[PDB]
PDB file of C-alpha atoms in Angstrom:
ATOM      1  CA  UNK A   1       7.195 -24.683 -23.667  1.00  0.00           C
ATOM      2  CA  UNK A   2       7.446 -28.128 -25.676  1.00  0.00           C
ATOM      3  CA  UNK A   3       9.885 -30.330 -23.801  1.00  0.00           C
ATOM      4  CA  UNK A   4       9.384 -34.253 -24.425  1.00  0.00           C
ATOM      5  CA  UNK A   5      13.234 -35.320 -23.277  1.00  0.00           C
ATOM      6  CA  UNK A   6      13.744 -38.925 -24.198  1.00  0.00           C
ATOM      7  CA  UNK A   7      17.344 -38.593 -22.730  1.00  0.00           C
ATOM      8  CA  UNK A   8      20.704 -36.599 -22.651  1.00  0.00           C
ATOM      9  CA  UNK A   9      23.718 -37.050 -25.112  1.00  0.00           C
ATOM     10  CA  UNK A  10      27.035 -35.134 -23.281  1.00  0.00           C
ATOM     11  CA  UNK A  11      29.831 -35.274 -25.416  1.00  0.00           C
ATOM     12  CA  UNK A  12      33.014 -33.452 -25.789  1.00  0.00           C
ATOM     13  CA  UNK A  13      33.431 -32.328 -29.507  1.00  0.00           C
ATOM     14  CA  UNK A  14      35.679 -30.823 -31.345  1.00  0.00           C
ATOM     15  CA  UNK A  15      34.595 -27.509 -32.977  1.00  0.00           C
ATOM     16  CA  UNK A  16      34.416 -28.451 -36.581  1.00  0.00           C
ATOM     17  CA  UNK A  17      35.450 -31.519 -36.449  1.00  0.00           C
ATOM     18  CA  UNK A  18      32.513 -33.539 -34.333  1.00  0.00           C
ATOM     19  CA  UNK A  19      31.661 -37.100 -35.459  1.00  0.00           C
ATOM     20  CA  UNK A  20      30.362 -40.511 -34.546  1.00  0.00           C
ATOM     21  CA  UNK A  21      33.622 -42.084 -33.997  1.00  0.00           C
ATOM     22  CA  UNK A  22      33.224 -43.899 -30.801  1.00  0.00           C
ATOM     23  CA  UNK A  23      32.128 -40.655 -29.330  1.00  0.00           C
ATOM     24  CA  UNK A  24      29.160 -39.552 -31.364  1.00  0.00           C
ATOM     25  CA  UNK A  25      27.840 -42.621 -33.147  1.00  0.00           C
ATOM     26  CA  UNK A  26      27.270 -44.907 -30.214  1.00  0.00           C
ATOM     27  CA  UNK A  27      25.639 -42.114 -27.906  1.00  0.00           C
ATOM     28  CA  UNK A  28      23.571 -40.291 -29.910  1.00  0.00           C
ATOM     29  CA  UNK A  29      22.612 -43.123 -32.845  1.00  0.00           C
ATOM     30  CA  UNK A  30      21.991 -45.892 -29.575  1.00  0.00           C
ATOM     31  CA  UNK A  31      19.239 -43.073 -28.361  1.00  0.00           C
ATOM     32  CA  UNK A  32      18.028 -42.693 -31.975  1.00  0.00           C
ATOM     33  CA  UNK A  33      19.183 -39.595 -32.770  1.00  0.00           C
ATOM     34  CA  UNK A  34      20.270 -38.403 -36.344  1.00  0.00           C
ATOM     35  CA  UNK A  35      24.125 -38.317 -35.811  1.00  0.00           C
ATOM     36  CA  UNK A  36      24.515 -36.450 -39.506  1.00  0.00           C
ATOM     37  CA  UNK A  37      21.455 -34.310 -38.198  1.00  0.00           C
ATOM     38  CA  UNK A  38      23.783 -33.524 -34.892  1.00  0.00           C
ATOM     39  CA  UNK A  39      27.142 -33.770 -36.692  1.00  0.00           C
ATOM     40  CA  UNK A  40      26.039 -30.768 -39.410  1.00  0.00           C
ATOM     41  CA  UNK A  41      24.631 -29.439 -36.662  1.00  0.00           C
ATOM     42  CA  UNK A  42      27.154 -29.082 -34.098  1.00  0.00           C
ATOM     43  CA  UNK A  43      29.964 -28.527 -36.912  1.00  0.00           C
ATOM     44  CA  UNK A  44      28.352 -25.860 -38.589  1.00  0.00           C
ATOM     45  CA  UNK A  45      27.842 -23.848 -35.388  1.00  0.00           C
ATOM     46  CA  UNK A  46      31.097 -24.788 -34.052  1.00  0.00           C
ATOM     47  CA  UNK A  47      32.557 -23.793 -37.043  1.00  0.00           C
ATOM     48  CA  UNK A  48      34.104 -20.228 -35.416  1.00  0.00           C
ATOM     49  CA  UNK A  49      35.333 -22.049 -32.377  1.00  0.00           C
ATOM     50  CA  UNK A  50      36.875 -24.687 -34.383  1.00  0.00           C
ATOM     51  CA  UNK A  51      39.738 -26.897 -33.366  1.00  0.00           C
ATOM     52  CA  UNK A  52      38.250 -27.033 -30.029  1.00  0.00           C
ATOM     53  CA  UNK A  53      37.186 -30.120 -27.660  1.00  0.00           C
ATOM     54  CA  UNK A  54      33.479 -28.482 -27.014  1.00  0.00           C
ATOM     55  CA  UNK A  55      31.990 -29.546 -23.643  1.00  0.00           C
ATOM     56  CA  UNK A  56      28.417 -30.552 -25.222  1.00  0.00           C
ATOM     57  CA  UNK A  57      25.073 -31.260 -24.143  1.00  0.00           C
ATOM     58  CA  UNK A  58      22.533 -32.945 -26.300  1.00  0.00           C
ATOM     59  CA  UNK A  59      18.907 -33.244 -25.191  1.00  0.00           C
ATOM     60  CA  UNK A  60      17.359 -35.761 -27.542  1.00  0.00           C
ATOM     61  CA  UNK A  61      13.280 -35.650 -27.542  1.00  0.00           C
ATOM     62  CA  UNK A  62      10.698 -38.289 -27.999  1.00  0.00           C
ATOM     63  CA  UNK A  63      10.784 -37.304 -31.722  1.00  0.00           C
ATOM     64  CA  UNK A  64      14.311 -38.567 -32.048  1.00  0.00           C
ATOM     65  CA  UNK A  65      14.407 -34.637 -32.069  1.00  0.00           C
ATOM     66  CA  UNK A  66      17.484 -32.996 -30.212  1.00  0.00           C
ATOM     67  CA  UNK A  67      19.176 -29.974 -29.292  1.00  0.00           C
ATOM     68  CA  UNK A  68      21.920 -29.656 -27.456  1.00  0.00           C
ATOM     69  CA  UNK A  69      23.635 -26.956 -25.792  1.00  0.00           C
ATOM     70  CA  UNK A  70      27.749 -26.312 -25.488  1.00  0.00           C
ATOM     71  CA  UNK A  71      29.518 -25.350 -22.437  1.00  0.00           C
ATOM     72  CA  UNK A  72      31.592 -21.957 -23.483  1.00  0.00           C
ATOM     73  CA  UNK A  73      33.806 -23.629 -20.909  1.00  0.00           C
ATOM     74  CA  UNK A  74      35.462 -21.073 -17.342  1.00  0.00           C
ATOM     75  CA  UNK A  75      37.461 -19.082 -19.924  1.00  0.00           C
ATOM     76  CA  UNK A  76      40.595 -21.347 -21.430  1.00  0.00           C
ATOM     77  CA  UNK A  77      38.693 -21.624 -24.481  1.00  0.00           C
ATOM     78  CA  UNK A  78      38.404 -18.275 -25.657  1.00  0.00           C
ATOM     79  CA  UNK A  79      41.422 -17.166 -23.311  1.00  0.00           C
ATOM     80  CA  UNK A  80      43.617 -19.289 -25.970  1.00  0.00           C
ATOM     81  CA  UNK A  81      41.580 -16.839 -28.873  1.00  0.00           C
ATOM     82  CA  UNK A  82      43.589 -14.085 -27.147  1.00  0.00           C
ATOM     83  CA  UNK A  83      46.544 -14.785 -24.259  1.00  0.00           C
ATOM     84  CA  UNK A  84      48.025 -15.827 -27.666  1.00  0.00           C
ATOM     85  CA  UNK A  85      48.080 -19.719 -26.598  1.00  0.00           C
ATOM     86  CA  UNK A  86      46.312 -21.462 -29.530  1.00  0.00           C
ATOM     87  CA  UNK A  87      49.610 -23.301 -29.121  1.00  0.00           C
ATOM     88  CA  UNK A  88      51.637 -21.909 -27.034  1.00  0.00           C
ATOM     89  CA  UNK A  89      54.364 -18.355 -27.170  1.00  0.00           C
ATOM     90  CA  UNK A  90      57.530 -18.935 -28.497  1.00  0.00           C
ATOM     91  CA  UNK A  91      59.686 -18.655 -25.405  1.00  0.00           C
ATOM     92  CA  UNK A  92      58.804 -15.332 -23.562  1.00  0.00           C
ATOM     93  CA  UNK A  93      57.064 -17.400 -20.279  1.00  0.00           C
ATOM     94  CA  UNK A  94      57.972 -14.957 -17.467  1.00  0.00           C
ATOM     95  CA  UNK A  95      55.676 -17.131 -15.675  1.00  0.00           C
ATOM     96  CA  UNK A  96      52.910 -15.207 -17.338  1.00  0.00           C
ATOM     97  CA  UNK A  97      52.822 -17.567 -20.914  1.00  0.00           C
ATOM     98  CA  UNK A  98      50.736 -14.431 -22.358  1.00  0.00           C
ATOM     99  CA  UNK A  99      48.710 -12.002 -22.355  1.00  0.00           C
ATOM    100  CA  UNK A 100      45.096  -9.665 -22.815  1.00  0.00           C
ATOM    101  CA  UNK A 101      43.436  -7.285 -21.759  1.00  0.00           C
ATOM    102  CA  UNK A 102      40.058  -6.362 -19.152  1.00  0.00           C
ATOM    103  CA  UNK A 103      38.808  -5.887 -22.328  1.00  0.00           C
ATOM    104  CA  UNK A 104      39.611  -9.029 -23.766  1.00  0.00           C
ATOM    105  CA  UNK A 105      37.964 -10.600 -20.722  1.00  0.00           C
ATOM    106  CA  UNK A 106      34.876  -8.448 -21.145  1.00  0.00           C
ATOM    107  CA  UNK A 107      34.405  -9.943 -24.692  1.00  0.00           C
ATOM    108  CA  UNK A 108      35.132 -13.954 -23.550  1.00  0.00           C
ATOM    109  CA  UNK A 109      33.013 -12.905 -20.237  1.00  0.00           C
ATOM    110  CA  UNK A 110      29.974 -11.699 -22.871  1.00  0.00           C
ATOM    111  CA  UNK A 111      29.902 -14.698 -25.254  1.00  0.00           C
ATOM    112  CA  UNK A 112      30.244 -17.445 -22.338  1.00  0.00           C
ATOM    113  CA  UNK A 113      27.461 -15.953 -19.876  1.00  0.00           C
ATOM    114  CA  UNK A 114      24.989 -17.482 -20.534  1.00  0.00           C
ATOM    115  CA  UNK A 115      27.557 -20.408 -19.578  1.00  0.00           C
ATOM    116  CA  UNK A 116      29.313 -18.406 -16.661  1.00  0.00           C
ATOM    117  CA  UNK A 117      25.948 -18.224 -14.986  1.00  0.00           C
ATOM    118  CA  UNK A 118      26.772 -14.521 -15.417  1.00  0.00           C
ATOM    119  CA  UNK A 119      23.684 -12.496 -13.043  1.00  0.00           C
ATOM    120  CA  UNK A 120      25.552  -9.468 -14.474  1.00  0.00           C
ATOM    121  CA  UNK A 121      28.977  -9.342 -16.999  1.00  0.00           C
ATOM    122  CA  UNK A 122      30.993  -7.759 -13.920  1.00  0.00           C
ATOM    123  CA  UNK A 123      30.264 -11.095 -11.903  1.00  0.00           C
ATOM    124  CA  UNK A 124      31.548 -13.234 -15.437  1.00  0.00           C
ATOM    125  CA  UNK A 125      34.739 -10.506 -15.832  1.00  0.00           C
ATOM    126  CA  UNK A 126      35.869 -11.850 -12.343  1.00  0.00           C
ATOM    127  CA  UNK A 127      35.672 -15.746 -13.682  1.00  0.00           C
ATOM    128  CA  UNK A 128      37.968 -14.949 -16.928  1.00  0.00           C
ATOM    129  CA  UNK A 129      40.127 -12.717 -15.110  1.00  0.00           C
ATOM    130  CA  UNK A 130      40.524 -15.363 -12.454  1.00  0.00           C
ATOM    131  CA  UNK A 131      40.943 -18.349 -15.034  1.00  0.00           C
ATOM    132  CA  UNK A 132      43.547 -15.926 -17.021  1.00  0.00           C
ATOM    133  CA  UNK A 133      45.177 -15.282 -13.865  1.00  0.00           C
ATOM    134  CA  UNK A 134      45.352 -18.981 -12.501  1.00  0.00           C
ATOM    135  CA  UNK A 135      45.967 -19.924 -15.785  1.00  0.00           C
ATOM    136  CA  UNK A 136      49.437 -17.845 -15.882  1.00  0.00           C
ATOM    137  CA  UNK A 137      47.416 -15.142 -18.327  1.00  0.00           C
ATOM    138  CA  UNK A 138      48.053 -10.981 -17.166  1.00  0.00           C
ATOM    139  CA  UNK A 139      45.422  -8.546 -18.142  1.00  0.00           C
ATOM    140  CA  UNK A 140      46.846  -5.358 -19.365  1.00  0.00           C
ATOM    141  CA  UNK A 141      44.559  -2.547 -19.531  1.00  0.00           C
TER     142      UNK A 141
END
Protein backbone atom coordinates (compact mmCIF):
# COMPACT_ATOMS: atom_id res chain seq x y z
CA UNK A 1 0.00 0.00 0.00
CA UNK A 2 1.30 3.63 -1.04
CA UNK A 3 3.36 4.95 1.84
CA UNK A 4 6.06 7.72 0.81
CA UNK A 5 6.44 9.32 4.63
CA UNK A 6 8.43 12.49 4.35
CA UNK A 7 8.03 12.87 8.21
CA UNK A 8 5.62 12.91 11.29
CA UNK A 9 3.61 16.00 12.61
CA UNK A 10 2.32 14.98 16.53
CA UNK A 11 0.34 17.57 17.85
CA UNK A 12 -2.16 17.93 20.54
CA UNK A 13 -5.35 19.68 19.11
CA UNK A 14 -8.22 20.77 20.23
CA UNK A 15 -11.36 19.14 18.71
CA UNK A 16 -12.77 21.93 16.68
CA UNK A 17 -10.70 24.31 17.41
CA UNK A 18 -7.07 23.10 15.80
CA UNK A 19 -4.84 25.80 14.24
CA UNK A 20 -1.38 26.94 13.34
CA UNK A 21 -0.81 29.00 16.31
CA UNK A 22 2.58 28.05 17.44
CA UNK A 23 1.35 24.53 17.47
CA UNK A 24 0.16 23.82 13.97
CA UNK A 25 1.76 26.41 11.72
CA UNK A 26 5.39 25.86 12.54
CA UNK A 27 5.16 21.89 12.50
CA UNK A 28 3.19 21.07 9.84
CA UNK A 29 3.82 24.36 7.33
CA UNK A 30 8.03 23.90 8.24
CA UNK A 31 7.45 20.13 6.69
CA UNK A 32 5.34 21.62 3.85
CA UNK A 33 2.22 20.55 4.67
CA UNK A 34 -1.12 22.44 3.89
CA UNK A 35 -1.98 23.66 7.49
CA UNK A 36 -5.70 24.89 6.10
CA UNK A 37 -5.63 21.38 4.28
CA UNK A 38 -4.91 19.78 8.00
CA UNK A 39 -6.77 22.47 9.97
CA UNK A 40 -10.32 21.71 7.87
CA UNK A 41 -9.26 18.53 8.14
CA UNK A 42 -8.72 17.76 11.63
CA UNK A 43 -11.63 20.32 12.67
CA UNK A 44 -14.16 18.92 10.63
CA UNK A 45 -13.60 15.39 11.95
CA UNK A 46 -13.03 16.54 15.35
CA UNK A 47 -15.99 18.36 15.18
CA UNK A 48 -18.12 15.63 17.59
CA UNK A 49 -15.29 15.46 20.04
CA UNK A 50 -14.97 19.10 20.17
CA UNK A 51 -13.53 21.13 22.99
CA UNK A 52 -11.00 18.52 23.38
CA UNK A 53 -6.97 18.64 23.43
CA UNK A 54 -6.74 15.60 20.68
CA UNK A 55 -3.49 13.59 21.02
CA UNK A 56 -2.66 13.74 17.07
CA UNK A 57 -0.52 12.13 14.68
CA UNK A 58 0.17 13.53 11.29
CA UNK A 59 2.11 11.52 8.70
CA UNK A 60 3.02 13.99 6.01
CA UNK A 61 4.11 12.21 2.50
CA UNK A 62 6.55 13.16 -0.14
CA UNK A 63 3.56 14.86 -1.87
CA UNK A 64 3.29 17.38 0.91
CA UNK A 65 0.32 14.83 1.27
CA UNK A 66 -0.68 13.88 4.97
CA UNK A 67 -2.87 12.02 7.11
CA UNK A 68 -2.80 11.81 10.42
CA UNK A 69 -4.31 9.71 12.93
CA UNK A 70 -5.79 10.82 16.67
CA UNK A 71 -5.19 9.02 19.80
CA UNK A 72 -8.95 8.30 21.30
CA UNK A 73 -6.79 8.73 24.38
CA UNK A 74 -7.04 5.51 27.79
CA UNK A 75 -10.65 6.64 28.35
CA UNK A 76 -10.76 10.39 30.13
CA UNK A 77 -11.84 11.67 26.94
CA UNK A 78 -14.96 10.07 26.34
CA UNK A 79 -15.25 9.14 30.20
CA UNK A 80 -15.89 13.12 30.60
CA UNK A 81 -18.87 12.45 27.56
CA UNK A 82 -20.47 10.40 30.36
CA UNK A 83 -19.07 10.30 34.31
CA UNK A 84 -20.76 13.73 33.79
CA UNK A 85 -17.23 15.66 34.10
CA UNK A 86 -17.18 17.90 30.97
CA UNK A 87 -16.51 20.24 33.89
CA UNK A 88 -16.88 18.87 36.78
CA UNK A 89 -20.40 17.75 39.32
CA UNK A 90 -21.67 20.28 41.34
CA UNK A 91 -20.65 19.08 44.77
CA UNK A 92 -21.77 15.36 45.18
CA UNK A 93 -17.76 13.96 45.18
CA UNK A 94 -18.15 10.98 47.55
CA UNK A 95 -14.80 10.34 46.32
CA UNK A 96 -16.43 8.94 43.24
CA UNK A 97 -16.79 12.69 41.20
CA UNK A 98 -19.40 10.64 38.90
CA UNK A 99 -20.63 8.18 37.33
CA UNK A 100 -21.61 5.41 34.16
CA UNK A 101 -22.27 2.48 33.43
CA UNK A 102 -20.43 -1.16 31.90
CA UNK A 103 -22.33 -0.03 29.26
CA UNK A 104 -21.08 3.28 29.00
CA UNK A 105 -17.60 1.74 29.00
CA UNK A 106 -18.57 -0.71 26.28
CA UNK A 107 -19.45 2.28 23.98
CA UNK A 108 -15.98 4.53 24.89
CA UNK A 109 -14.17 0.89 24.81
CA UNK A 110 -15.77 0.46 20.96
CA UNK A 111 -14.94 3.89 19.48
CA UNK A 112 -11.24 4.04 21.04
CA UNK A 113 -10.08 0.35 19.99
CA UNK A 114 -8.62 0.74 17.42
CA UNK A 115 -6.60 3.16 19.90
CA UNK A 116 -6.85 0.75 23.03
CA UNK A 117 -5.01 -1.82 20.98
CA UNK A 118 -8.27 -3.65 21.74
CA UNK A 119 -7.47 -7.77 20.42
CA UNK A 120 -11.13 -8.10 21.53
CA UNK A 121 -13.72 -5.17 23.22
CA UNK A 122 -13.64 -7.29 26.62
CA UNK A 123 -9.73 -6.65 26.77
CA UNK A 124 -10.62 -2.49 25.94
CA UNK A 125 -13.81 -2.72 28.69
CA UNK A 126 -11.04 -3.52 31.32
CA UNK A 127 -8.88 -0.20 30.19
CA UNK A 128 -12.08 2.26 30.60
CA UNK A 129 -13.28 0.55 33.53
CA UNK A 130 -9.82 0.82 35.02
CA UNK A 131 -9.26 4.57 33.87
CA UNK A 132 -13.01 5.30 35.28
CA UNK A 133 -12.07 3.59 38.32
CA UNK A 134 -8.54 5.26 38.89
CA UNK A 135 -9.98 8.19 37.70
CA UNK A 136 -12.59 8.32 40.79
CA UNK A 137 -15.49 7.21 38.01
CA UNK A 138 -18.09 4.00 39.45
CA UNK A 139 -19.73 1.90 36.87
CA UNK A 140 -23.26 1.15 37.71
CA UNK A 141 -24.80 -1.57 35.86
Amino acid sequence: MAKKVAAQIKLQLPAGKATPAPPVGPALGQHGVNIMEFCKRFNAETADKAGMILPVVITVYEDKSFTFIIKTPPASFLLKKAAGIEKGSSEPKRKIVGKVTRKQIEEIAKTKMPDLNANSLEAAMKIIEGTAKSMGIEVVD
